[PDB]
Structures are given as structure tokens and as C-alpha cells.
Amino acid sequence: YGFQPTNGVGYQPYRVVVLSFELLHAPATVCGPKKSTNLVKNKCVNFNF
Amino acid sequence: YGFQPTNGVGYQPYRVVVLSFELLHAPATVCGPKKSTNLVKNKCVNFNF
């Protein structure tokens, strides 16, 4: 490449990262800040197990 | 000014410094990177006093 600070757009260097990840194949182990709550029973509730 | 990294030449910021010299009126105190020599006399020589 010929990266020079005087070059116009379409020639300046860009930094690129691609994120790939499997939806589900096993016990998942990568995810963010969801607060693990307690456990309730014998009631109609919604859950995010 | 509207300096943006996407701006083309003729709009990116430039840094400028100007140096002005007075042409000597007193014992000078800003000399070049020269080294002095011993003093001779009674001989045809050239000098840089």
C-alpha cells in the first residue's frame, strides 16, 4: 500500500474487525450483564433460562 | 475552523512558525555552532571576528 497522510479518502488506512460467533452448540459461555435472579415456582411467570 | 480528519488538503490544520532576525546592533549573543581558535598576529590571514 501507499498510505500517505496527504492522500484523499478512499486511500487512507481503515481498521476493520469482524465478529463471528455460534448461536448455540453447547452450554453457552459468552454473554453480558444479565443479573442472575432467584428462582420461583408454581406461578405463571416469564423466564430467560 | 472546522478541522475534520476527512477534510481534504487545503483544509487540514497546518502549524506555522516564523523566525525574524535583527541584523546586529550590539554584542551578539546568538552565534552559530562554530568553535573558536587561538589568536595569531603579524601574518597575512583571514578572520571571522
Q: How was this structure determined?
A: cryo-EM
* Mutation choice for A interface testing from B3, B9, B14, B15 by most A CBs within 10 A: B9
CB B9 within 8 A of CB A9: no
Taking the C-alpha atoms of residue A37 and residue A49, their distance in angstroms, rounded to an integer, is 11
What does this entry list as its resolution, in Å?
3.3
* The three grid cell numbers given for residue B43, joined into one nine-digit string: 601574518
* The three grid cell numbers given for residue B41, joined into one nine-digit string: 598576529
Taking the C-alpha atoms of residue A7 and residue B18, their distance in angstroms, rounded to an integer, is 27
CB B37 within 8 A of CB B28: no
Contact check, Cβ <8 Å, B6/A6: no
How far, in Å, are A16, A22, A35 from residue A19 at the CA level? 10, 10, 24
Whole-number CA gyration radius for chain B: 23
Residue B29: what residue type?
A: T
DSSP B27: S
